[PDB]
């Protein structure tokens, strides 16, 4: 059915452009009514609409914004782009596009889950994935992933096939400036005998894809 | 423009029950008001759009009301999957604007965490600095604290805390403490302790690991 995802560089220097894409599934631009929007949130501030662009082409832009803004689709319509000009760190922020549900009323019926973009002057740094190891029914295990810039990273176990007993946490600002997370999951101690455990780690702005096993 | 504000910020609730949130605009928005559910890992979703029509796939148990001014959001079977940010956004007037949010939590009973006790790997210590992790497992409610002794020295300022947001379907929550020293302290010392106070706890727990075991 209906879905939407949101790409873009995840780190830039200030005062470059931001350019962002938004792909989507279970509709078309060329579909009367159809619409996307762009909505963004700064951290730990609220939700903020940008720019949405409908069907025929006709757009709109946060006017507080409006002269940096620039949104468009492509001519099938499966695409939205959007740029945003020489941004400074207020421009950090989660961004999101979404779906219109109606041909003129400005309400998100779909989503994305947004996409992740820093604003920073500092250089990007890949994680160490370090094992958190079963010490001894039921063990905890998992993942320390260490020492990255920017935000996200993203743990996956057995390639998705182990979501039950997971805790990924929120990922802590150490006093370096860079981050630390750990993904943890409790299993049963018999299915340490049988069952290997790993943890897959990305973190697409140093383009690091470590598959971690972690034994006991 | 229109100021959108969301009353209260924060509300805790049972399971079973019925709340009502509460969302109000600075001029008047006819009757084009949106709300959307929030939820870690999962796309946000509508709930209601023009005031009180309930979107296609929404469980009736979700109705909204309210015109002009004010309107609000009221859920009626409150399950453990509803906890979440509630937003509201005004659809009327260009520029579209959003709600502070409302967070629910979901209330259930006292529950002590399992705890969790991990070493640095050999890994790590070849880089001269040491992680160790205390993980406190499913707990309720949110308020607990972790003490890390090294010797049966009491820490201080450096260790850091991350919590879970409340888990969907048993409503409890998860904690990670890290400890961080360079390895030239970590060799020093030999008893590596997490202790543990909570409301499920009858005294502190303390959960230990000896280097080099």
């Known amino acids: 059915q209906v879905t939407l995802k949101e790409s873009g560089p995840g780190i830039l220097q200030p005062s470059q452009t931001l350019s962002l894409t938004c792909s989507f599934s279970?509709?078309?631009?060329?579909?009367?009514?159809?619409?996307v929007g762009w909505i963004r949130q700064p951290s730990g501030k609220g939700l903020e609409w940008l720019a949405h662009?409908?069907?025929?082409?006709?757009?709109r832009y946060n006017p507080a914004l409006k002269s940096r803004l620039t949104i468009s689709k492509d001519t099938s319509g499966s695409q939205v782009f959007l740029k945003i000009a020489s941004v400074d760190t207020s421009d950090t922020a989660t961004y999101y596009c979404?779906?219109?549900?109606?041909?003129?009323?400005?309400?998100?019926?779909?989503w994305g889950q947004g996409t992740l973009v820093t604003v920073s002057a500092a250089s990007t740094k890949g994680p160490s994935v370090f094992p958190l190891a079963p010490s001894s029914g039921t063990a905890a295990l998992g993942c320390l992933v260490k020492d990255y810039f920017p935000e996200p990273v993203t743990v996956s176990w057995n390639s998705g096939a182990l979501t039950s007993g997971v805790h990924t946490f929120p990922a802590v600002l150490q006093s370096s400036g860079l981050y630390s997370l750990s993904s943890v999951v409790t299993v049963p101690s018999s299915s340490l005998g049988t069952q290997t455990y790993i943890c897959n780690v990305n973190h697409k702005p140093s383009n690091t894809k470590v598959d971690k096993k972690v034994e006991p | 423009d229109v100021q959108i504000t969301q009353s209260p910020s924060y509300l805790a609730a049972s399971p079973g029950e019925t709340i009502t949130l509460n969302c109000r605009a600075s001029?008047?928005?006819?009757?084009?008001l949106a709300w959307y559910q929030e939820k870690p890992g999962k796309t946000n979703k509508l709930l209601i759009y023009?005031?009180?029509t309930l979107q296609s796939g929404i469980p009736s148990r979700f109705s909204g009301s309210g015109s002009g001014t004010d309107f609000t959001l009221t859920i009626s079977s409150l399950e453990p999957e509803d906890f979440a940010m509630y937003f509201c956004?005004?659809?009327?007037?260009?520029?579209?604007?959003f709600g502070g949010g409302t967070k629910l939590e979901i209330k259930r009973t006292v529950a002590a965490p399992s705890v969790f006790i991990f070493p640095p790997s050999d890994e790590q210590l070849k880089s001269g600095t040491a992680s160790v992790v205390c993980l406190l497992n499913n707990f309720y409610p949110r308020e607990a604290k972790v003490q890390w002794k090294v010797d049966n020295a009491l820490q201080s300022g450096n260790s850091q805390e991350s919590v879970t947001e409340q888990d969907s379907k048993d409503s409890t929550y998860s904690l990670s403490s890290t400890l961080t020293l360079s390895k030239a302290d970590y060799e020093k010392h030999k008893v590596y302790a997490c202790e543990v106070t909570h409301q499920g706890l009858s005294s502190p727990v303390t959960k230990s690991f000896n280097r080099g075991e």
């Open positions: 956004q005004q659809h009327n007037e260009y520029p579209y604007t």
């Open positions: 023009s005031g009180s």
């Open positions: 001029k008047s928005i006819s009757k084009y």
């Open positions: 662009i409908w069907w025929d082409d006709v757009k």
């Open positions: 279970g509709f078309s631009l060329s579909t009367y009514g159809m619409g």
């Open positions: 979404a779906r219109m549900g109606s041909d003129y009323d400005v309400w998100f019926d779909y």
